[PDB]
């Protein structure tokens, strides 16, 4: 489920971002923002895997899916 993105993991991320005090209605939104981000990137990674006639989503399919959003990822 999306419930695995727990309350203190969203809080930790916010701490990294620079958030001081965080209202309650932000984890669900984040859970709903993170799910949209994954539904946009995994769709392209699955498209590259089905185009490569594979069944295993490699890390270069994820790098290509992030490259199609202007989010180039170095190290794979």
């Amino acid at each position: 489920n999306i419930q695995g993105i727990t309350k203190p993991a969203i809080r930790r991320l916010a701490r990294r971002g620079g958030v001081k005090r965080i209202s309650g209605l932000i984890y669900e939104e984040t859970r709903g923002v993170l799910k949209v981000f994954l539904e946009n990137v995994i769709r392209d990674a699955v498209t590259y895997t089905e185009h490569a006639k594979r069944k295993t989503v490699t890390a270069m399919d994820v790098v290509y899916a992030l490259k199609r959003q202007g989010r180039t990822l170095y190290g794979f």
């Binding site: 180039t72 170095y74 190290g75 794979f76």
Partner: protein, 88 residues
């Protein structure tokens, strides 16, 4: 692919400082990305002018387009003072 030359330039710029093994893959993905971006952009340039040969002039324009500002200036000065040193 390009990892053998990243360490060779690093021996010139910092002969005392070493590099890790993940940072070599990061610099190798950086080089294969700015290569497939400059060549891609240059390919677009060679199509917009209906040419067929990528010369050094389409590389100088793709460097002016891709790199912003002083990096493009410096980028175009090093390529020019390497082609002139090459022809001589």
């Amino acid at each position: 692919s390009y990892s053998i030359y990243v360490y060779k330039v690093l021996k010139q710029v910092h002969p005392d400082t070493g590099i890790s093994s993940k940072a070599m893959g990061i610099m190798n993905s950086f080089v294969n990305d700015i290569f497939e971006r400059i060549a891609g952009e240059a390919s677009r340039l060679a199509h917009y002018n209906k040419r067929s040969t990528i010369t050094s002039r389409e590389i100088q324009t793709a460097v002016r387009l891709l790199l912003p500002g002083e990096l493009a200036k410096h980028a175009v000065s090093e390529g020019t003072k390497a082609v002139t040193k090459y022809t001589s």
